[PDB]
Structure 1
Amino acid sequence: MIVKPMVRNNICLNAHPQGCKKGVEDQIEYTKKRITAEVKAGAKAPKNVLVLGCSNGYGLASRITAAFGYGAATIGVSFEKAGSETKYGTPGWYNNLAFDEAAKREGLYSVTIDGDAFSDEIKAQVIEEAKKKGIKFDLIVYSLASPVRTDPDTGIMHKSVLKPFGKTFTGKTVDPFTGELKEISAEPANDEEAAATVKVMGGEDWERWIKQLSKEGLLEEGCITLAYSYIGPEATQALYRKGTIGKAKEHLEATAHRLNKENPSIRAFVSVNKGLVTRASAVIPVIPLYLASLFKVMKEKGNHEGCIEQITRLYAERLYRKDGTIPVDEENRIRIDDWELEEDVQKAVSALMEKVTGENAESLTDLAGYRHDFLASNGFDVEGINYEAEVERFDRI
Structure 2
Amino acid sequence: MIVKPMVRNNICLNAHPQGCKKGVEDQIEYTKKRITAEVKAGAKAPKNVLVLGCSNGYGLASRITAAFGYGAATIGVSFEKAGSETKYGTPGWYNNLAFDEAAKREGLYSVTIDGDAFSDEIKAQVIEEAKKKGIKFDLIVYSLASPVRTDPDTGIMHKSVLKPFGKTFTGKTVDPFTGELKEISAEPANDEEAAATVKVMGGEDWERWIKQLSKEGLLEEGCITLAYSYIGPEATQALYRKGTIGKAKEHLEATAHRLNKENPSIRAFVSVNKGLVTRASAVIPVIPLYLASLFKVMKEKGNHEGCIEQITRLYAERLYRKDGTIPVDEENRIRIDDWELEEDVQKAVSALMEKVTGENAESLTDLAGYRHDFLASNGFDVEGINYEAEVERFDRILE
Deviation of 1:41 after TM superposition, in Å, equals 1.4
Deviation of 1:323 after TM superposition, in Å, equals 1.0
Q: Deviations over 1:66-124 (max 9, x none)?
A: 00000000000000000000001000000000000000011000000000000000000
SS in 2 for 1:324: coil
SS in 1 for 2:290: helix
Aligned length: 397
Within-5 A mapping of 1:368-379: 368-379=368-379
Deviation of 1:374 after TM superposition, in Å, equals 0.3
Q: TM-score, normalised by structure 2?
A: 0.99
Deviation of 1:261 after TM superposition, in Å, equals 0.2
Q: Deviations over 1:324-350 (max 9, x none)?
A: 110001000000000000100000000
Does structure 1 residue 218 correspond to structure 2 residue 218?
yes
Deviation of 1:10 after TM superposition, in Å, equals 1.0
Deviation of 1:298 after TM superposition, in Å, equals 0.3
- CA separation in 2, counterparts of 1:249 and 1:185? 21
- CA separation in 1, counterparts of 2:105 and 2:40? 22
Task: Indicate the residue corresponding to 1:332 in structure 2.
Answer: 332
Deviation of 1:154 after TM superposition, in Å, equals 1.2
Q: Deviations over 1:112-161 (max 9, x none)?
A: 00000000000000000001100200000000011000001111100110
Q: Deviations over 1:286-341 (max 9, x none)?
A: 00000001000000000100000000000000001111110001000000000000
Q: Deviations over 1:237-268 (max 9, x none)?
A: 00000100110011001100000000110110
SS in 2 for 1:12: coil
SS in 1 for 2:235: helix
Does structure 1 residue 299 correspond to structure 2 residue 299?
yes
- CA separation in 2, counterparts of 1:50 and 1:391? 33
- CA separation in 1, counterparts of 2:140 and 2:155? 26
Query: Structure 1 stretches (4+) deviating beyond 4 angstroms?
Result: none
Task: Indicate the residue corresponding to 1:28 in structure 2.
Answer: 28
Deviation of 1:358 after TM superposition, in Å, equals 1.6
- CA separation in 2, counterparts of 1:244 and 1:50? 29
- CA separation in 2, counterparts of 1:129 and 1:21? 26
- CA separation in 2, counterparts of 1:256 and 1:346? 28
Deviation of 1:395 after TM superposition, in Å, equals 1.0
- CA separation in 1, counterparts of 2:383 and 2:113? 29
- CA separation in 1, counterparts of 2:390 and 2:58? 30
SS in 2 for 1:234: coil
- CA separation in 1, counterparts of 2:144 and 2:375? 21
Unaligned runs of 5+ in 1: none
SS in 2 for 1:362: helix
Unaligned runs of 5+ in 2: none
- CA separation in 2, counterparts of 1:89 and 1:164? 34
- CA separation in 2, counterparts of 1:392 and 1:11? 25
- CA separation in 1, counterparts of 2:229 and 2:235? 17
Q: Deviations over 1:146-198 (max 9, x none)?
A: 10000011111001100000000001110110010011111000111111100
- CA separation in 2, counterparts of 1:249 and 1:144? 13
SS in 1 for 2:69: helix
- CA separation in 2, counterparts of 1:393 and 1:200? 35
Q: Deviations over 1:358-390 (max 9, x none)?
A: 211111000000000000000000000000000
Within-5 A mapping of 1:46-195: 46-195=46-195
SS in 2 for 1:8: coil
- CA separation in 2, counterparts of 1:253 and 1:145? 16
- CA separation in 1, counterparts of 2:324 and 2:9? 47
SS in 2 for 1:86: coil
- CA separation in 2, counterparts of 1:361 and 1:135? 53
- CA separation in 1, counterparts of 2:170 and 2:131? 51
- CA separation in 1, counterparts of 2:82 and 2:37? 37
- CA separation in 1, counterparts of 2:201 and 2:395? 32
- CA separation in 2, counterparts of 1:135 and 1:324? 22
SS in 1 for 2:246: helix
- CA separation in 2, counterparts of 1:2 and 1:184? 34
Q: Deviations over 1:9-42 (max 9, x none)?
A: 1100000000000000000000000001111110
- CA separation in 2, counterparts of 1:201 and 1:225? 17
Superposition CA RMSD, Å:
0.5
- CA separation in 2, counterparts of 1:360 and 1:128? 56
Does structure 1 residue 252 correspond to structure 2 residue 252?
yes
Task: Indicate the residue corresponding to 1:202 in structure 2.
Answer: 202
- CA separation in 1, counterparts of 2:152 and 2:5? 36
SS in 2 for 1:235: coil
- CA separation in 2, counterparts of 1:191 and 1:314? 36
